[PDB]
Curated annotation (Swiss-Prot), chains A, B, C, D, E, F, G, H, I, J, K, L:
The chain holds residues 47 to 70 of 89 of the full protein. Amyloid fibrils are degraded by insulin-degrading enzyme IDE. The mature protein is largely unstructured in the absence of a cognate ligand, and has a strong tendency to form fibrillar aggregates. Homodimerization may be the first step of amyloid formation. Can form homodimers. Interacts with IDE and INS. Interaction with INS inhibits homodimerization and fibril formation. This is Islet amyloid polypeptide. It is found in: Secreted. Amylin/IAPP is a glucoregulatory peptide hormone that plays an important role in the regulation of energy homeostasis. Selectively inhibits insulin-stimulated glucose utilization and glycogen deposition in muscle, while not affecting adipocyte glucose metabolism. IAPP function is mediated by the CALCR-RAMPs (AMYRs) receptor complexes. Amylin can also bind CALCR receptor in the absence of RAMPs, although it is more selective for AMYRs. The gene is IAPP. The modification Tyrosine amide is found at Y24. Belongs to the calcitonin family. IAPP is the peptide subunit of amyloid found in pancreatic islets of type 2 diabetic patients and in insulinomas.
Length: 24, 24, 24, 24, 24, 24, 24, 24, 24, 24, 24, 24
């Protein structure tokens, strides 16, 4: 069992996450 | 069993996620 | 069993996800 | 058993997903 | 058993998905 | 059992996360 | 100008929507 | 100008929405 | 100009939304 | 200009939202 | 200009939101 | 200009939000 995980990133990443604004 | 996972990214990524704004 | 997964990205990606705005 | 998965992307991708706006 | 999957993309893709706006 | 995990980052990353603004 | 919209639902509704699984 | 919107729901609703699983 | 919006819900609602699982 | 918004909820609501699991 | 917003909730609400698990 | 906002909650609310687990 030989397992290899490779992740390479070379680009700018912009992330906006909004969770909420719910009225109950 | 030989397993290889390769992920390469070279492009700018913009992500906007909005979860919410529900009225109950 | 030889398994290889390769993912290469070179293009700009723009993603907008909106989940919500439901009135109950 | 030899398995190979290759995915290559070179084009700009724009995705808009809206789930919601349901009145109950 | 030799299996090969190849996907190559070179064109701009624009996708708009709207699920919702149902009145109950 | 041979396991290798490699993560390499070379791009600027900007992340904004907002959780809240719920009225009860 | 008098306008009235009335929607009444009394039956169980099951909806499954799958958008995707496209290879480019 | 008199406008009235009324929505009444009395039935169980089950909704499954899957957007994605696209290979580029 | 008289405007009235009324929404009443009395039934159990189950919603599952999955957006993603795209390979680029 | 008279405006009234009324939302009443009496049923249990279960919501699961998953955004992600994308490989770039 | 008379504006009234009323929101009343009487049912148990369970919400699970997962944003992430993306490999770059 | 008369404005009134009223929010009333009487039901137990359980919320789980996970943002993260991204590999770069």
């Amino acid at each position: 069992n030989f397992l290899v995980h490779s992740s390479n990133n070379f680009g700018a990443i912009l992330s906006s996450t909004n969770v909420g604004s719910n009225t109950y």
